[PDB]
Protein backbone atom coordinates (compact mmCIF):
# COMPACT_ATOMS: atom_id res chain seq x y z
CA UNK A 1 0.00 0.00 0.00
CA UNK A 2 0.87 3.68 0.20
CA UNK A 3 3.88 4.40 2.40
CA UNK A 4 5.78 7.49 3.53
CA UNK A 5 8.75 8.71 1.48
CA UNK A 6 11.40 11.47 1.59
CA UNK A 7 12.93 13.66 -1.14
CA UNK A 8 16.07 15.77 -0.76
CA UNK A 9 16.45 18.73 -3.11
CA UNK A 10 19.00 21.50 -2.83
CA UNK A 11 17.91 24.21 -5.24
CA UNK A 12 21.49 25.05 -6.20
CA UNK A 13 22.44 21.59 -7.48
CA UNK A 14 21.39 22.61 -10.98
CA UNK A 15 23.47 25.77 -11.10
CA UNK A 16 26.92 24.21 -11.46
CA UNK A 17 28.56 24.20 -14.89
CA UNK A 18 30.78 21.32 -15.96
CA UNK A 19 32.18 23.19 -18.97
CA UNK A 20 31.24 23.83 -22.59
CA UNK A 21 30.32 20.62 -24.39
CA UNK A 22 30.55 18.49 -21.26
CA UNK A 23 27.78 15.87 -21.44
CA UNK A 24 27.67 15.87 -17.66
CA UNK A 25 25.11 18.68 -17.42
CA UNK A 26 23.75 19.17 -13.88
CA UNK A 27 20.69 21.11 -15.03
CA UNK A 28 18.70 17.88 -15.28
CA UNK A 29 17.76 17.72 -11.60
CA UNK A 30 16.24 21.19 -11.69
CA UNK A 31 13.85 20.37 -14.50
CA UNK A 32 13.03 17.08 -12.79
CA UNK A 33 12.00 18.91 -9.64
CA UNK A 34 10.01 21.53 -11.54
CA UNK A 35 8.12 18.83 -13.42
CA UNK A 36 7.34 17.10 -10.14
CA UNK A 37 6.14 20.38 -8.63
CA UNK A 38 3.81 21.16 -11.54
CA UNK A 39 2.44 17.61 -11.44
CA UNK A 40 1.16 18.37 -7.94
CA UNK A 41 3.23 15.59 -6.37
CA UNK A 42 4.63 17.61 -3.45
CA UNK A 43 1.37 17.38 -1.50
CA UNK A 44 1.97 13.67 -0.89
CA UNK A 45 5.80 13.74 -0.59
CA UNK A 46 8.16 15.57 1.78
CA UNK A 47 10.98 17.64 0.25
CA UNK A 48 14.09 18.26 2.35
CA UNK A 49 17.29 20.29 2.16
CA UNK A 50 20.43 18.09 2.25
CA UNK A 51 23.16 19.11 4.67
CA UNK A 52 26.53 19.48 2.98
CA UNK A 53 28.61 16.42 3.77
CA UNK A 54 31.67 17.11 5.88
CA UNK A 55 35.07 16.05 4.58
CA UNK A 56 35.21 13.69 7.57
CA UNK A 57 32.26 11.81 6.08
CA UNK A 58 34.05 11.67 2.74
CA UNK A 59 37.31 10.35 4.20
CA UNK A 60 35.39 7.37 5.59
CA UNK A 61 36.00 5.86 2.15
CA UNK A 62 38.23 8.20 0.14
CA UNK A 63 41.88 8.99 0.74
CA UNK A 64 42.50 12.15 2.73
CA UNK A 65 44.95 13.39 0.10
CA UNK A 66 42.21 13.06 -2.53
CA UNK A 67 39.77 15.09 -0.44
CA UNK A 68 42.41 17.74 0.25
CA UNK A 69 43.01 17.99 -3.49
CA UNK A 70 39.30 18.21 -4.22
CA UNK A 71 38.69 20.94 -1.66
CA UNK A 72 41.78 22.96 -2.59
CA UNK A 73 41.35 22.83 -6.38
CA UNK A 74 39.91 25.77 -8.31
CA UNK A 75 39.90 26.85 -11.97
CA UNK A 76 42.16 29.83 -11.22
CA UNK A 77 45.05 27.76 -9.84
CA UNK A 78 45.47 25.13 -12.54
CA UNK A 79 49.20 25.89 -12.75
CA UNK A 80 49.95 25.23 -9.08
CA UNK A 81 48.58 21.68 -9.05
CA UNK A 82 49.34 20.12 -12.45
CA UNK A 83 51.33 17.23 -10.98
CA UNK A 84 48.47 16.26 -8.68
CA UNK A 85 45.91 16.83 -11.43
CA UNK A 86 47.68 14.31 -13.62
CA UNK A 87 48.05 12.08 -10.58
CA UNK A 88 44.30 12.19 -9.87
CA UNK A 89 42.71 11.79 -13.34
CA UNK A 90 41.32 15.34 -13.35
CA UNK A 91 41.42 16.97 -16.76
CA UNK A 92 39.77 16.33 -20.10
CA UNK A 93 37.44 13.56 -18.95
CA UNK A 94 36.71 14.88 -15.44
CA UNK A 95 37.30 18.63 -15.41
CA UNK A 96 37.75 21.21 -12.68
CA UNK A 97 35.05 23.88 -12.45
CA UNK A 98 33.64 26.41 -10.01
CA UNK A 99 32.29 24.91 -6.81
CA UNK A 100 33.06 21.31 -7.75
CA UNK A 101 33.69 20.49 -4.11
CA UNK A 102 30.33 22.02 -3.21
CA UNK A 103 28.67 19.88 -5.88
CA UNK A 104 30.28 16.73 -4.53
CA UNK A 105 29.36 17.81 -1.00
CA UNK A 106 25.70 18.11 -1.91
CA UNK A 107 25.64 14.92 -3.98
CA UNK A 108 27.03 12.74 -1.20
CA UNK A 109 25.13 14.57 1.54
CA UNK A 110 21.76 13.83 0.00
CA UNK A 111 22.24 10.08 -0.15
CA UNK A 112 24.03 9.85 3.20
CA UNK A 113 21.14 11.69 4.86
CA UNK A 114 18.73 9.32 3.16
CA UNK A 115 20.74 6.43 4.55
CA UNK A 116 20.69 7.92 8.06
CA UNK A 117 16.91 8.30 7.94
CA UNK A 118 16.52 4.81 6.47
CA UNK A 119 18.61 3.28 9.26
CA UNK A 120 16.45 5.08 11.83
CA UNK A 121 13.36 3.41 10.28
CA UNK A 122 11.64 6.81 9.97
CA UNK A 123 10.73 5.97 6.36
CA UNK A 124 11.08 3.02 4.01
CA UNK A 125 11.91 4.97 0.84
CA UNK A 126 13.98 8.05 0.05
CA UNK A 127 14.92 9.69 -3.25
CA UNK A 128 17.98 11.74 -4.21
CA UNK A 129 18.35 12.28 -7.95
CA UNK A 130 21.53 14.32 -7.51
CA UNK A 131 23.64 11.43 -6.25
CA UNK A 132 24.48 7.93 -7.40
CA UNK A 133 27.85 8.80 -8.94
CA UNK A 134 29.41 5.36 -9.22
CA UNK A 135 32.54 5.68 -11.37
CA UNK A 136 34.57 7.41 -8.66
CA UNK A 137 37.30 5.30 -7.14
CA UNK A 138 39.11 5.20 -3.79
CA UNK A 139 41.51 7.94 -4.84
CA UNK A 140 40.64 9.01 -8.38
CA UNK A 141 37.85 10.64 -10.36
CA UNK A 142 36.60 8.75 -13.38
CA UNK A 143 33.49 8.60 -15.53
CA UNK A 144 32.27 12.12 -14.65
CA UNK A 145 32.06 11.05 -10.99
CA UNK A 146 34.29 12.52 -8.26
CA UNK A 147 33.12 11.26 -4.85
CA UNK A 148 31.53 7.81 -4.95
CA UNK A 149 28.36 8.67 -3.04
CA UNK A 150 26.76 5.20 -3.19
CA UNK A 151 29.57 3.54 -1.25
CA UNK A 152 29.21 6.06 1.56
CA UNK A 153 25.46 5.49 1.63
CA UNK A 154 26.00 1.74 1.85
CA UNK A 155 28.58 2.10 4.61
CA UNK A 156 26.07 4.16 6.57
CA UNK A 157 23.28 1.62 6.00
CA UNK A 158 25.43 -1.33 7.10
CA UNK A 159 25.41 0.02 10.66
CA UNK A 160 21.99 -1.61 11.16
CA UNK A 161 21.34 -3.85 8.13
CA UNK A 162 22.95 -7.27 7.85
CA UNK A 163 22.60 -7.68 4.06
CA UNK A 164 21.89 -5.08 1.38
CA UNK A 165 21.46 -5.24 -2.41
CA UNK A 166 22.93 -2.82 -4.93
CA UNK A 167 21.24 -2.76 -8.35
CA UNK A 168 22.78 -0.89 -11.26
CA UNK A 169 20.64 -0.29 -14.33
CA UNK A 170 22.98 2.24 -15.95
CA UNK A 171 24.40 1.42 -19.37
CA UNK A 172 27.85 1.71 -17.80
CA UNK A 173 29.21 -0.70 -15.22
CA UNK A 174 29.37 0.38 -11.59
CA UNK A 175 33.09 -0.32 -11.48
CA UNK A 176 33.87 1.73 -8.39
CA UNK A 177 31.00 0.39 -6.33
CA UNK A 178 31.84 -3.23 -7.12
CA UNK A 179 35.56 -2.70 -6.57
CA UNK A 180 34.77 -1.27 -3.14
CA UNK A 181 32.77 -4.34 -2.08
CA UNK A 182 34.67 -6.80 -4.27
CA UNK A 183 35.92 -8.80 -1.27
CA UNK A 184 33.02 -8.76 1.19
CA UNK A 185 29.97 -10.86 1.93
CA UNK A 186 27.78 -7.99 3.16
CA UNK A 187 26.94 -6.54 -0.28
CA UNK A 188 26.04 -7.85 -3.73
CA UNK A 189 26.67 -5.71 -6.80
CA UNK A 190 24.20 -6.67 -9.53
CA UNK A 191 25.14 -4.72 -12.65
CA UNK A 192 23.40 -4.80 -16.02
CA UNK A 193 25.66 -3.09 -18.51
CA UNK A 194 26.71 -2.96 -22.12
CA UNK A 195 30.11 -4.56 -22.69
CA UNK A 196 32.56 -4.33 -25.55
CA UNK A 197 34.80 -1.37 -26.38
CA UNK A 198 32.73 0.63 -23.90
CA UNK A 199 33.64 2.59 -20.82
CA UNK A 200 35.03 1.50 -18.45
CA UNK A 201 35.98 -1.75 -20.17
CA UNK A 202 35.40 -3.96 -17.13
CA UNK A 203 32.49 -6.15 -16.09
CA UNK A 204 32.74 -9.56 -17.74
CA UNK A 205 30.66 -12.64 -16.97
CA UNK A 206 33.33 -14.17 -14.73
CA UNK A 207 34.12 -11.12 -12.59
CA UNK A 208 32.20 -13.02 -9.95
CA UNK A 209 33.95 -11.88 -6.78
CA UNK A 210 36.82 -12.71 -4.51
CA UNK A 211 37.71 -13.92 -1.05
CA UNK A 212 34.73 -14.18 1.23
CA UNK A 213 32.78 -12.19 -1.35
CA UNK A 214 33.32 -14.78 -4.04
CA UNK A 215 30.05 -15.57 -5.84
CA UNK A 216 28.77 -12.30 -4.31
CA UNK A 217 29.23 -10.09 -7.38
CA UNK A 218 27.18 -10.76 -10.53
CA UNK A 219 27.57 -8.91 -13.83
CA UNK A 220 25.44 -9.06 -16.98
CA UNK A 221 27.15 -7.90 -20.18
CA UNK A 222 24.78 -6.96 -22.99
CA UNK A 223 24.96 -5.84 -26.61
CA UNK A 224 23.58 -2.84 -28.47
CA UNK A 225 19.90 -2.21 -28.83
CA UNK A 226 18.44 -4.02 -25.86
CA UNK A 227 14.72 -3.33 -25.78
CA UNK A 228 11.86 -3.17 -23.33
CA UNK A 229 10.40 -6.67 -23.16
CA UNK A 230 13.85 -8.28 -23.34
CA UNK A 231 14.96 -6.26 -20.31
CA UNK A 232 11.73 -7.13 -18.53
CA UNK A 233 12.03 -10.87 -19.13
CA UNK A 234 15.65 -10.80 -17.95
CA UNK A 235 15.22 -8.54 -14.91
CA UNK A 236 12.32 -10.02 -12.94
CA UNK A 237 13.66 -13.62 -12.73
CA UNK A 238 17.24 -12.65 -11.84
CA UNK A 239 16.05 -10.20 -9.19
CA UNK A 240 13.47 -12.60 -7.76
CA UNK A 241 16.08 -15.31 -7.33
CA UNK A 242 18.77 -12.94 -6.03
CA UNK A 243 16.52 -11.67 -3.27
CA UNK A 244 15.15 -15.13 -2.57
CA UNK A 245 18.61 -16.59 -1.91
CA UNK A 246 20.28 -13.51 -0.35
CA UNK A 247 17.25 -12.28 1.59
CA UNK A 248 18.57 -8.73 2.11
CA UNK A 249 17.27 -6.08 4.48
CA UNK A 250 17.80 -2.94 2.36
CA UNK A 251 18.01 -2.26 -1.37
CA UNK A 252 19.77 0.52 -3.29
CA UNK A 253 18.92 1.30 -6.92
CA UNK A 254 20.99 3.38 -9.33
CA UNK A 255 18.49 4.54 -11.97
CA UNK A 256 21.01 5.46 -14.61
CA UNK A 257 18.91 7.07 -17.33
CA UNK A 258 21.62 6.84 -20.00
CA UNK A 259 20.16 3.45 -20.96
CA UNK A 260 17.20 5.18 -22.63
CA UNK A 261 16.53 5.35 -26.35
CA UNK A 262 18.30 8.14 -28.20
CA UNK A 263 20.92 8.97 -25.57
CA UNK A 264 23.95 11.05 -26.51
CA UNK A 265 26.38 8.29 -25.52
CA UNK A 266 24.09 5.29 -25.04
CA UNK A 267 23.21 2.43 -27.37
CA UNK A 268 20.26 0.89 -25.53
CA UNK A 269 16.60 1.30 -26.52
CA UNK A 270 14.59 1.17 -23.31
CA UNK A 271 11.44 3.23 -22.80
CA UNK A 272 10.31 5.10 -19.70
CA UNK A 273 7.62 2.50 -18.97
CA UNK A 274 10.21 -0.24 -19.40
CA UNK A 275 12.60 1.65 -17.14
CA UNK A 276 10.02 2.07 -14.38
CA UNK A 277 9.11 -1.61 -14.64
CA UNK A 278 12.33 -2.25 -12.73
CA UNK A 279 11.38 0.03 -9.85
CA UNK A 280 7.93 -1.54 -9.55
CA UNK A 281 9.54 -4.99 -9.59
CA UNK A 282 12.01 -4.19 -6.82
CA UNK A 283 9.48 -2.32 -4.68
CA UNK A 284 6.92 -5.14 -4.87
CA UNK A 285 9.23 -7.18 -2.64
CA UNK A 286 8.58 -4.64 0.16
CA UNK A 287 12.00 -3.79 1.56
CA UNK A 288 13.44 -0.42 2.63
CA UNK A 289 14.70 1.28 -0.51
CA UNK A 290 17.08 4.03 -1.65
CA UNK A 291 16.94 5.49 -5.17
CA UNK A 292 19.89 7.41 -6.60
CA UNK A 293 20.64 9.21 -9.84
CA UNK A 294 23.67 8.87 -12.08
CA UNK A 295 23.95 9.00 -15.86
CA UNK A 296 21.48 10.30 -18.42
CA UNK A 297 22.55 12.74 -21.10
CA UNK A 298 19.55 13.34 -23.41
CA UNK A 299 18.28 15.86 -20.96
CA UNK A 300 14.57 15.86 -21.81
CA UNK A 301 14.39 12.07 -21.61
CA UNK A 302 16.27 12.13 -18.31
CA UNK A 303 13.70 14.50 -16.87
CA UNK A 304 10.86 12.33 -18.16
CA UNK A 305 12.29 9.10 -16.78
CA UNK A 306 13.16 10.37 -13.33
CA UNK A 307 9.81 12.10 -12.97
CA UNK A 308 7.91 8.97 -13.93
CA UNK A 309 9.77 6.61 -11.64
CA UNK A 310 9.40 9.04 -8.77
CA UNK A 311 5.65 9.13 -9.38
CA UNK A 312 5.69 5.32 -9.41
CA UNK A 313 7.38 5.36 -6.01
CA UNK A 314 4.39 7.26 -4.59
CA UNK A 315 2.12 4.67 -6.26
CA UNK A 316 0.68 7.61 -8.19
CA UNK A 317 -0.26 7.69 -11.87
CA UNK A 318 0.08 10.86 -13.94
CA UNK A 319 -1.52 11.93 -17.25
CA UNK A 320 0.57 11.20 -20.33
CA UNK A 321 0.20 14.89 -21.16
CA UNK A 322 2.91 16.97 -19.54
CA UNK A 323 1.57 19.94 -17.54
CA UNK A 324 3.05 23.37 -18.06
CA UNK A 325 6.51 24.05 -16.66
CA UNK A 326 9.29 26.62 -16.98
CA UNK A 327 11.11 24.33 -19.42
CA UNK A 328 8.06 23.23 -21.40
CA UNK A 329 9.62 23.96 -24.77
CA UNK A 330 12.25 21.24 -24.29
CA UNK A 331 9.75 18.43 -24.90
CA UNK A 332 8.82 19.39 -28.45
CA UNK A 333 7.20 18.64 -30.72
CA UNK A 334 4.87 16.11 -29.06
CA UNK A 335 5.13 17.27 -25.42
CA UNK A 336 4.19 13.88 -23.97
CA UNK A 337 5.40 12.04 -20.87
CA UNK A 338 6.28 8.69 -22.45
CA UNK A 339 8.79 8.31 -25.27
CA UNK A 340 8.57 6.01 -28.28
CA UNK A 341 11.53 3.68 -28.84
CA UNK A 342 13.81 3.73 -31.83
CA UNK A 343 13.92 0.82 -34.26
CA UNK A 344 17.58 -0.19 -34.54
CA UNK A 345 18.44 -3.87 -34.68
CA UNK A 346 18.66 -5.69 -31.34
CA UNK A 347 21.89 -7.64 -31.18
CA UNK A 348 20.85 -9.38 -27.92
CA UNK A 349 19.46 -12.53 -29.54
CA UNK A 350 17.22 -14.79 -27.43
CA UNK A 351 19.61 -17.72 -27.05
CA UNK A 352 22.34 -15.38 -25.83
CA UNK A 353 19.88 -14.14 -23.23
CA UNK A 354 19.03 -17.71 -22.24
CA UNK A 355 22.67 -18.78 -21.92
CA UNK A 356 23.77 -15.76 -19.89
CA UNK A 357 20.72 -16.10 -17.64
CA UNK A 358 21.41 -19.80 -17.09
CA UNK A 359 25.06 -19.20 -16.21
CA UNK A 360 24.02 -16.53 -13.72
CA UNK A 361 21.48 -18.90 -12.18
CA UNK A 362 24.09 -21.63 -11.77
CA UNK A 363 26.55 -19.17 -10.25
CA UNK A 364 23.93 -17.94 -7.77
CA UNK A 365 23.02 -21.49 -6.75
CA UNK A 366 26.42 -21.68 -5.00
CA UNK A 367 25.48 -19.09 -2.40
CA UNK A 368 25.16 -20.63 1.08
Amino acid sequence: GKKKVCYYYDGDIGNYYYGQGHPMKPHRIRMTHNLLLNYGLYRKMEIYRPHKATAEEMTKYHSDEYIKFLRSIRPDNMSEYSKQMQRFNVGEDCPVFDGLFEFCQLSTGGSVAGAVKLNRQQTDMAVNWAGGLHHAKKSEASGFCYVNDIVLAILELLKYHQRVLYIDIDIHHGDGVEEAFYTTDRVMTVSFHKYGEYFPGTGDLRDIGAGKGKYYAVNFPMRDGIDDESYGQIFKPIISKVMEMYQPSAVVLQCGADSLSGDRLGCFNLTVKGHAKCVEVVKTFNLPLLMLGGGGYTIRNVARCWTYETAVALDCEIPNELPYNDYFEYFGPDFKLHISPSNMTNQNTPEYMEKIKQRLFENLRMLP
Partner: protein, 163 residues
Protein backbone atom coordinates in the same frame (compact mmCIF):
# COMPACT_ATOMS: atom_id res chain seq x y z
CA UNK B 1 76.22 -15.10 -28.17
CA UNK B 2 73.87 -15.36 -25.16
CA UNK B 3 72.49 -18.45 -23.44
CA UNK B 4 69.24 -19.37 -21.67
CA UNK B 5 67.60 -16.23 -23.02
CA UNK B 6 63.86 -17.25 -22.73
CA UNK B 7 63.91 -15.40 -19.40
CA UNK B 8 64.04 -12.30 -21.60
CA UNK B 9 60.70 -13.32 -23.10
CA UNK B 10 59.19 -13.43 -19.61
CA UNK B 11 60.73 -10.06 -18.78
CA UNK B 12 59.26 -8.59 -21.95
CA UNK B 13 55.82 -10.05 -21.24
CA UNK B 14 55.62 -8.87 -17.64
CA UNK B 15 57.02 -5.40 -18.41
CA UNK B 16 55.26 -4.40 -21.64
CA UNK B 17 52.61 -7.08 -22.25
CA UNK B 18 51.18 -7.93 -18.84
CA UNK B 19 51.66 -4.30 -17.73
CA UNK B 20 53.25 -5.59 -14.50
CA UNK B 21 56.03 -3.36 -13.22
CA UNK B 22 59.14 -4.22 -11.22
CA UNK B 23 59.93 -3.32 -7.63
CA UNK B 24 62.06 -0.21 -7.37
CA UNK B 25 63.97 -1.40 -4.25
CA UNK B 26 63.39 -5.11 -4.82
CA UNK B 27 66.69 -6.65 -3.61
CA UNK B 28 70.27 -7.37 -4.67
CA UNK B 29 71.12 -4.21 -6.60
CA UNK B 30 73.11 -4.61 -9.79
CA UNK B 31 76.38 -3.34 -8.32
CA UNK B 32 75.80 -5.62 -5.33
CA UNK B 33 75.22 -8.58 -7.66
CA UNK B 34 78.41 -7.71 -9.52
CA UNK B 35 80.30 -7.65 -6.21
CA UNK B 36 78.78 -11.05 -5.40
CA UNK B 37 80.00 -12.37 -8.77
CA UNK B 38 83.47 -11.00 -8.06
CA UNK B 39 83.52 -12.69 -4.64
CA UNK B 40 82.25 -16.02 -6.00
CA UNK B 41 84.60 -16.18 -8.99
CA UNK B 42 87.63 -15.32 -6.85
CA UNK B 43 87.30 -18.77 -5.23
CA UNK B 44 87.36 -20.67 -8.56
CA UNK B 45 90.98 -20.66 -9.70
CA UNK B 46 93.75 -21.92 -7.46
CA UNK B 47 95.85 -18.86 -8.36
CA UNK B 48 93.86 -16.22 -10.27
CA UNK B 49 96.43 -13.48 -10.54
CA UNK B 50 94.08 -12.23 -13.29
CA UNK B 51 91.92 -10.77 -10.54
CA UNK B 52 93.38 -7.44 -11.70
CA UNK B 53 91.28 -7.97 -14.84
CA UNK B 54 88.35 -9.75 -13.16
CA UNK B 55 87.61 -6.82 -10.87
CA UNK B 56 88.25 -4.35 -13.69
CA UNK B 57 85.68 -5.98 -15.97
CA UNK B 58 83.17 -6.25 -13.11
CA UNK B 59 83.61 -2.53 -12.46
CA UNK B 60 83.33 -2.00 -16.20
CA UNK B 61 79.93 -3.67 -16.07
CA UNK B 62 79.12 -1.23 -13.26
CA UNK B 63 80.20 1.84 -15.25
CA UNK B 64 78.35 0.66 -18.34
CA UNK B 65 75.23 0.19 -16.23
CA UNK B 66 75.84 3.76 -15.02
CA UNK B 67 75.30 5.91 -18.10
CA UNK B 68 73.62 3.52 -20.53
CA UNK B 69 70.59 2.97 -18.29
CA UNK B 70 67.50 4.84 -19.43
CA UNK B 71 68.59 5.66 -22.98
CA UNK B 72 67.94 2.43 -24.88
CA UNK B 73 67.48 -0.14 -22.12
CA UNK B 74 63.98 0.43 -20.76
CA UNK B 75 60.62 0.05 -22.51
CA UNK B 76 58.04 2.73 -23.23
CA UNK B 77 56.06 1.61 -20.19
CA UNK B 78 59.21 2.21 -18.12
CA UNK B 79 59.70 5.93 -18.80
CA UNK B 80 57.74 6.99 -15.67
CA UNK B 81 59.82 4.58 -13.59
CA UNK B 82 63.09 6.08 -14.77
CA UNK B 83 61.69 9.59 -14.32
CA UNK B 84 60.68 8.87 -10.73
CA UNK B 85 64.09 7.32 -10.05
CA UNK B 86 65.86 10.38 -11.45
CA UNK B 87 63.59 12.83 -9.62
CA UNK B 88 63.56 11.11 -6.21
CA UNK B 89 67.14 9.94 -5.53
CA UNK B 90 69.41 11.56 -8.14
CA UNK B 91 72.40 11.97 -5.82
CA UNK B 92 71.90 8.35 -4.76
CA UNK B 93 73.76 5.70 -6.80
CA UNK B 94 71.88 5.58 -10.09
CA UNK B 95 73.58 2.25 -10.81
CA UNK B 96 71.68 0.89 -7.80
CA UNK B 97 68.07 0.14 -6.78
CA UNK B 98 67.31 -1.36 -10.18
CA UNK B 99 67.28 -5.13 -9.89
CA UNK B 100 68.95 -7.90 -11.84
CA UNK B 101 66.51 -8.39 -14.78
CA UNK B 102 67.57 -5.04 -16.23
CA UNK B 103 71.17 -6.30 -16.32
CA UNK B 104 70.56 -8.98 -18.94
CA UNK B 105 69.06 -6.36 -21.26
CA UNK B 106 72.39 -4.53 -21.22
CA UNK B 107 74.22 -7.60 -22.47
CA UNK B 108 71.48 -8.35 -25.01
CA UNK B 109 71.98 -4.88 -26.47
CA UNK B 110 75.78 -4.94 -26.29
CA UNK B 111 76.06 -8.05 -28.47
CA UNK B 112 74.86 -6.08 -31.47
CA UNK B 113 75.89 -2.62 -30.20
CA UNK B 114 79.56 -3.61 -30.02
CA UNK B 115 79.51 -3.69 -33.85
CA UNK B 116 80.35 0.04 -33.98
CA UNK B 117 83.54 0.05 -31.85
CA UNK B 118 86.63 -1.55 -33.52
CA UNK B 119 88.54 -3.15 -30.65
CA UNK B 120 91.56 -5.41 -31.12
CA UNK B 121 91.20 -9.15 -31.54
CA UNK B 122 92.57 -10.33 -28.18
CA UNK B 123 90.62 -7.75 -26.17
CA UNK B 124 87.34 -8.60 -27.88
CA UNK B 125 88.10 -12.29 -27.38
CA UNK B 126 88.57 -11.79 -23.64
CA UNK B 127 85.40 -9.70 -23.42
CA UNK B 128 83.50 -12.42 -25.28
CA UNK B 129 84.79 -15.04 -22.85
CA UNK B 130 83.82 -12.98 -19.82
CA UNK B 131 80.35 -12.30 -21.19
CA UNK B 132 80.05 -16.04 -21.73
CA UNK B 133 80.97 -17.19 -18.23
CA UNK B 134 79.09 -14.34 -16.56
CA UNK B 135 76.00 -15.49 -18.42
CA UNK B 136 76.60 -19.17 -17.65
CA UNK B 137 76.78 -18.41 -13.93
CA UNK B 138 73.58 -16.41 -14.36
CA UNK B 139 71.96 -19.39 -16.09
CA UNK B 140 73.16 -21.67 -13.29
CA UNK B 141 71.25 -19.91 -10.49
CA UNK B 142 68.59 -17.99 -12.41
CA UNK B 143 65.70 -19.74 -10.65
CA UNK B 144 67.15 -18.86 -7.23
CA UNK B 145 67.72 -15.20 -8.18
CA UNK B 146 65.24 -14.30 -10.93
CA UNK B 147 61.65 -14.32 -9.65
CA UNK B 148 58.59 -13.09 -11.56
CA UNK B 149 56.17 -13.87 -8.70
CA UNK B 150 56.89 -10.55 -6.94
CA UNK B 151 55.94 -8.31 -9.87
CA UNK B 152 53.49 -5.58 -8.92
CA UNK B 153 51.22 -3.90 -11.45
CA UNK B 154 50.34 -0.38 -12.55
CA UNK B 155 47.06 1.26 -11.49
CA UNK B 156 45.56 3.64 -14.08
CA UNK B 157 47.48 6.56 -12.55
CA UNK B 158 50.74 4.99 -13.70
CA UNK B 159 49.08 4.33 -17.06
CA UNK B 160 48.38 8.05 -17.44
CA UNK B 161 51.90 8.85 -16.23
CA UNK B 162 53.37 6.50 -18.87
CA UNK B 163 51.25 7.42 -21.90
Amino acid sequence: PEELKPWLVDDWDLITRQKQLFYLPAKKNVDSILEDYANYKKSRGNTDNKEYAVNEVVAGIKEYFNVMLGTQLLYKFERPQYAEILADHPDAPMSQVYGAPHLLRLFVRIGAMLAYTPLDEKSLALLLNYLHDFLKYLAKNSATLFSASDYEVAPPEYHRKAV
